[PDB]
Amino acid sequence: MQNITQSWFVQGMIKATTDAWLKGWDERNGGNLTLRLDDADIAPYHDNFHQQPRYIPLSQPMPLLANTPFIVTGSGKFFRNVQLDPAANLGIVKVDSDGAGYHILWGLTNEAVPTSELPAHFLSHCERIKATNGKDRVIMHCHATNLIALTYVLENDTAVFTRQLWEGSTECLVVFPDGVGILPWMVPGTDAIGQATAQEMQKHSLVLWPFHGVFGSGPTLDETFGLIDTAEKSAQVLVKVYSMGGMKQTISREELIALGKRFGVTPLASALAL
Amino acid sequence: MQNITQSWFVQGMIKATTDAWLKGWDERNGGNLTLRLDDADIAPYHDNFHQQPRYIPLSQPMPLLANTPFIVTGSGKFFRNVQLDPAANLGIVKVDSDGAGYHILWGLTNEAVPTSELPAHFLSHCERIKATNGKDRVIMHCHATNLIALTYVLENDTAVFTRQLWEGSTECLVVFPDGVGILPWMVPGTDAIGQATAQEMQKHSLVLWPFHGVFGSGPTLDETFGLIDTAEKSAQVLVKVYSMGGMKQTISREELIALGKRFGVTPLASALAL
Amino acid sequence: MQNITQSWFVQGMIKATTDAWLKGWDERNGGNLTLRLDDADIAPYHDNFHQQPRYIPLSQPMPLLANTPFIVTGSGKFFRNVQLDPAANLGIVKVDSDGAGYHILWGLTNEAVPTSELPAHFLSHCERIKATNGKDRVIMHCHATNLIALTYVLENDTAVFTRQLWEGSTECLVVFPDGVGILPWMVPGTDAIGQATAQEMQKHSLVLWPFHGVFGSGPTLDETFGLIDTAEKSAQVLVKVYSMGGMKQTISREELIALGKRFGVTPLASALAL
Amino acid sequence: MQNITQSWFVQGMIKATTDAWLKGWDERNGGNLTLRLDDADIAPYHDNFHQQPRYIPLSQPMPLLANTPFIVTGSGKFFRNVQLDPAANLGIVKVDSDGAGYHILWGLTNEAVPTSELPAHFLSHCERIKATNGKDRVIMHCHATNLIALTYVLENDTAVFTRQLWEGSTECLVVFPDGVGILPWMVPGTDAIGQATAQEMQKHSLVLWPFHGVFGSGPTLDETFGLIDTAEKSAQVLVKVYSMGGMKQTISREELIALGKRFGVTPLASALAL
Ligand SMILES: O=C(CO)CO
Ligand SMILES: O=C(CO)CO
Ligand SMILES: O=C(CO)CO
Ligand SMILES: O=C(CO)CO
Ligand SMILES: [Zn+2]
Ligand SMILES: [Zn+2]
Ligand SMILES: [Zn+2]
Ligand SMILES: [Zn+2]
């Protein structure tokens, strides 16, 4: 088969990271992205793999991910550079049979390793697999500018934040009816923040890290990017509105309820009750 | 003739959707676009059509559109992706002889269907055909950021909104002398919102959906995109001005009247009277 | 010689208009650009000229421009499209021997004509030729967003506007020491506004049209684009500062004087006196 | 070896300047960039050098830079144009054996000379070489929009400015734990401002020029660009927050301390003490 660089998943990783770079969401090495693949996706490209894949342990056992391949962004790597050198900035890893570690089948050249937020990513994948019966396959983190700004001015509360974001663009309730979870500020790159994020992922597809950024989950790269882009678009609208003195009118509870009924989604109750 | 992908209309659809994506007006699947063609436009490309075009009924009879071909964006499709796979994200449809349904002559692969706002689009085309003696051929919907923000702060009234937009850039009165209609918030994707939009299209080339976006109509893709871009540019200026404490000076009624006289347009009376 | 489309001047016109489109300064047909050439620039491309160049009269005699060639943008044409079809959107014109009209040597296909602001352009070229002993060769008009916004909030006065723009970026006084002239609002596309603009051009390289845009003059496309980009950058900074409650500190008169002395420019006295 | 235009350093200079142009940080000739190379980097490209390299003296002796090659942007040159003509807009210079002047080995065609901020650049390189034991190799200056805006509203004090920037994005303390030095406004392009900047560079990797821009230092083009992009991203967030009425919550001192401990950096004490 064609070279792996031309595969749908490598090309998709390039598109998502490049698009996020262009959005201004990924300065420096900010942000990280992981996509769960199937063996059938990568098997045809066996000739492109490293002859002797490097092994690295996980920070904690993840048996649910045993034998599972992922394509991931690297630690310290810049989203802006992914398009310039995919193999340097991305890696395909396959988790071993006990979920204790993984082999780097392709990429992450020059002793690069996967993103330092691997705990947040892999733990969230585990919870999203459970919550969606295996449908979700992507965890994306970026420094979405307006969402970040809003964490300094809105109450850092799931119901309040969710409700404002729903109000900021009509489509929002349909795209994220489960709302947006928000953690307290925590030191990034740790097992603790990864575990805290994964817990929020049990109930929400979006999780905010105050004064830092956002994590999103979805079935495909486009749907996950689109989820974040939707929330960030609403946030952009809100920042403008708040800068102009606040809402004089907005989407009402009754309107949100009608919207949910039409699209067959049940809105997060706490956000709806406000 | 060359492949249909290289046709002026497919290329035009790619340009408009890509440009709107770059403007930040079309996150996820937000927005939709339809362009009315003539049989002579598509006839030369018969060899590129599906051998057995799929049939889909319309939600209501539209006899005015009998036998009329259109190129359209697909339901759930992303403007960002149109350039990557035109046939997946766009379709050429031809309405049948009673205006009861249409055949998908080209595109909308993998069981895709036209935009879920087809009622708003096709009903608006009908009213614009009548209002412009067949000159208007495009209906475009996008999530124009500043216009959306303004719907939370300005009175959601045709005269007031029109007047502010005219004031926000000198060219506005010349580009949309009929003004901007504004609906109450409504659940999107319905026959009701489509009908409500089409009614506003009888009197205006621009219609706002509060907390959602805008619909525009025009004779060509460029003129329709340009119409929306003009209104959105004015809105962008207004958001800046309002964020700085409001207008200390602006275009006066007398100036708007002089402008209308020079360019041979009659400004919407209600907006002028303010 | 190579085809005229590959000439430095056609390529330069494409670059400037495309760059301005990307800046968000030229929605629809907003903006226009004219560049004065020498016969030696176009003579080598005689084979690319129309066999029978169209003649169009000027609105008033301009003997100073007798026998002078220019490359210009067309009326109703979009800056966004120049790169797609240079010959459709641009034209090379040569003013006749009495300065009464011009022939369209190249471009402006399908009966297109030069920009409707030709009076403002050609009259300003005349005054800039006189004011700079023939050094200035470009007149550029665009809808620079932040400058437009500022015309609704700052006093529409040359000294005040100049002084704020100088304060908004250190380089400004060096780039436009003569300041920025500001007209009262006037109906665009007329001989009157053209004449009023040209009068301001006797004393300034930048002229603002309130609630509309800006005109700049310079020796080359890059220097003229750069002049406007500098003023617009300062305006962008100012809009942010004003939105944050205003200046707590800024560049002082004494600092501006020192800056002028170092760079060998004499700052507009009225703006300096504030 | 391949042509020097395809070298990692010429390509890197093109990427950094083009990226900064796209960010809106380098209107006109604003900004300048210098990268310290090793002889081994340029030696393979000897065939591409000027046959008779031009000599230019430095404004003051810099013996620490004796025999050192650099690639630099030119005086009056536009970042936007670097990609179009690298040899016109960039030059490779090699400082002579007493650090009294340099030869232009490549580029800076048509009598171009290095940036007029060469004193700030070369003096800062000297201090950064000392401060980082030769690890830092880049000095970058740009007109970062939000940082500039903040200099009109925040106290122009190292501790205060540093602390706000740390608060504006979690990563900031990790990326610039030494903080951001801020000079008083000074006339640019002088030995004095160069010396003042270099002094600040002894203690900080970022230095602000009020009402003007920023200087950054780092080991590579990407790390230095990323440093500035990080500070500017935080500034962008802050401008939004301040425009919305200010922080209701933010990163606390205790959180910053925990962050520093985790990442093994010691935060600038004065900024932490606030
Ligand atoms: O975004 C990150 C990459 O540095 C970490 O949270
Ligand atoms: O914009 C839309 C596409 O989801 C619908 O109004
Ligand atoms: O900008 C213009 C083009 O329509 C006119 O002033
Ligand atoms: O940015 C500069 C280039 O003009 C100088 O400080
Ligand atoms: Zn992060
Ligand atoms: Zn919509
Ligand atoms: Zn104009
Ligand atoms: Zn500078």
Shortest-distance Cα residue to atom 4 of ligand 3: C30
Q: What is the phi/psi pair of residue C209, to 5°?
A: -110, 105
A62 alpha carbon, distance to own chain's centre: 19
Q: Which of D149, D189, D243 sits opposite C237 (nearest CB)?
A: D149
Structural domain for B188, as ranges: 1-274
The catalytically annotated residue of B27, B117, B171, B254 is B117
Grouping H, G, I as helix, E, B as strand and the rest as coil, residue D175 is helix
What are the strands of the beta sheet with D101-107, ordered from one edge? D54-57, D101-107, D90-95, D69-73, D32-36, D138-142, D213-218, D206-209, D180-182
Atom nearest to B209 CA in ligand 2: 6
**Count of C-beta atoms within a 10 Å radius of residue C61:** 13
Q: Which ligand is in closest contact with the Cα of A190?
A: 1
Catalytic residues of D: 117
Residue type, C46: H
Please say whether the beta carbons of D180 and D207 come within 8 A: yes
Neighboring chain C residues of D143 at a CB cutoff of 8 Å: 169, 233
Instruction: Tell me the nearest-neighbour CA distance from B15 into chain C, angstroms.
Output: 10
**Count of C-beta atoms within a 10 Å radius of residue D3:** 10
Residue type, A12: G
Q: Which residues does D174 contact at the CB level (< 8 Å), separation at least 6?
A: D259, D260, D263, D265
Q: How close is the Cα of B192 to the center of ligand 2, in Å?
A: 15
Alpha helices in chain C (DSSP H): 8-23, 39-42, 86-89, 118-131, 145-150, 158-167, 172-175, 191-201, 221-243, 253-263, 269-272
Place of tokens 């990563």: D171
* Resolution to 1 decimal place, in Å: 1.4
Grouping H, G, I as helix, E, B as strand and the rest as coil, residue B51 is coil
Q: How close is the Cα of A30 to the center of ligand 1, in Å?
A: 4
Which chains contact B through at least 3 pairs of Cβ atoms less than 8 Å apart?
A, C
Q: How close is the Cα of C176 to the center of ligand 3, in Å?
A: 24
Biggest distance spanned by C-alpha atoms of chain A:
63
The rounded distance, in Å, linking the Cα atoms of B164 and B180 is 10
Please say whether the beta carbons of D172 and D166 come within 8 A: yes
Atom nearest to A170 CA in ligand 2: 6
The rounded distance, in Å, linking the Cα atoms of B8 and B26 is 22
- Structure tokens belonging to residue A143: 């420094």
Q: Which of D170, D240, D247 sits opposite A212 (nearest CB)?
A: D170
DSSP D227: H
Neighboring chain A residues of D19 at a CB cutoff of 8 Å: 80
Q: How buried is C234 (Cβ within 10 angstroms: 0-12 exposed, 13-18 middle, 19+ buried)?
A: buried
β-bridge mates for residue D71, sequence order:
D35, D92
C233 alpha carbon, distance to own chain's centre: 16
Place of tokens 């300047």: D17
Q: Pick from D43, D35, D66, D227: which is nearest to D136 by CA? A: D35
Which residue ranges of A are tagged as binding site for Zn(2+)?
141, 143, 212
Atom nearest to C76 CA in ligand 3: 4
Nearest-10 Cα torsion for D238, D241, D243, D248:
-130
**Count of C-beta atoms within a 10 Å radius of residue A154:** 23
Q: What is the phi/psi pair of residue D107, to 5°?
A: 75, -160
The rounded distance, in Å, linking the Cα atoms of B148 and B208 is 8
Start-to-end CA span in chain B (Å)? 54
Neighboring chain B residues of C153 at a CB cutoff of 8 Å: 241, 244-248
Shortest-distance Cα residue to atom 4 of ligand 4: D30
β-bridge mates for residue D180, sequence order:
D206
Q: Pick from A139, A104, A122: which is nearest to A33 by CA? A: A139
The rounded distance, in Å, linking the Cα atoms of B27 and A225 is 9
Residue type, B52: Q
Biggest distance spanned by C-alpha atoms of chain D:
63
Taking any CB pair shorter than 8 Å as contact, residues of chain A touching chain B are 19, 167-171, 175, 222, 226-227, 229-230, 232-233, 236-237, 240-241, 243-251, 255, 258-259, 262
Q: Pick from A79, B22, C23, C163: which is nearest to D26 by CA? A: C23
The rounded distance, in Å, linking the Cα atoms of C256 and A101 is 63
Burial B121-157 (b: 16+ CB within 10 A, else e): bbbbbbbbbebeeeebbbbbbbbbbbbbbbbbbbebe
Nearest-10 Cα torsion for C25, D146, A76, A116:
-110
* Residue C117 appears among annotated catalytic residues: yes
Grouping H, G, I as helix, E, B as strand and the rest as coil, residue D130 is helix
Atom nearest to D28 CA in ligand 4: 4
In SS3 terms, chain A reads as CCCHHHCHHHHHHHHHHHHHHHHCCCCCCCCEEEEECCHHHHHHHHHHCCCCCEEEECCCCCHHHCCCEEEEEECCCCHHHCCCCHHHHEEEEEECCCCCEEEEEEECCCCCCECCCHHHHHHHHHHHHHHCCCCCCEEEEECCHHHHHHCCCCCCCHHHHHHHHHHCCCCHHHHCCCCEEECCCCCCCCHHHHHHHHHHHCCCCEEEECCCEEEEEECCHHHHHHHHHHHHHHHHHHHHHHHCCCCCCCCCHHHHHHHHHHHCCCCCHHHHCC
Which technique? X-ray
Distance set, CA C29 to CA A167, B225, B234, C79 (Å): 34, 11, 14, 7
Q: Which residues does D158 contact at the CB level (< 8 Å), separation at least 6?
A: D179, D180, D181, D182, D204, D268, D270, D271
- Structure tokens belonging to residue A165: 């974001």
Please say whether the beta carbons of D151 and D208 come within 8 A: yes
- Structure tokens belonging to residue D145: 């929009």
Distance set, CA B95 to CA B13, B122, B125 (Å): 19, 10, 13
The rounded distance, in Å, linking the Cα atoms of A213 and A207 is 9
- Structure tokens belonging to residue B241: 């001005």
DSSP H or E stretch at residue D228: helix D221-243
Q: What is the phi/psi pair of residue C74, to 5°?
A: -90, 160
D53 alpha carbon, distance to own chain's centre: 26
HSE value, Cβ hemisphere, 13 Å, CA-based, for B122: 33
Q: Pick from B187, B268, B266, B169: which is nearest to B226 by CA? A: B169
Q: Which of A240, A247, A248 sits opposite B239 (nearest CB)?
A: A240
**Count of C-beta atoms within a 10 Å radius of residue D8:** 10
Please say whether the beta carbons of A109 and A88 come within 8 A: yes
Residue type, B8: W
Known binding residue D103? Answer is no
| DSSP E strands, C58-185 | 69-73, 90-95, 101-107, 138-142, 180-182
The rounded distance, in Å, linking the Cα atoms of D224 and D41 is 19
Shortest-distance Cα residue to atom 3 of ligand 1: A30
The rounded distance, in Å, linking the Cα atoms of B223 and B230 is 10
DSSP H or E stretch at residue D104: strand D101-107
Lining residues, ligand 4, CB within 6 Å: C 171; D 29-32, 117, 141, 188
The rounded distance, in Å, linking the Cα atoms of D51 and C204 is 44
Residue type, C69: P
The rounded distance, in Å, linking the Cα atoms of B113 and B77 is 10
**Count of C-beta atoms within a 10 Å radius of residue D155:** 13
- Structure tokens belonging to residue B28: 């996820």
Please say whether the beta carbons of B82 and B5 come within 8 A: no
Please say whether the beta carbons of A91 and A104 come within 8 A: yes
Interior angle at CA C268, CA C265 and CA C273, nearest 5? 120
Domain count, chain A: 1
- Report the CATH number that the domain containing residue D51 is assigned in CATH: 3.40.225.10
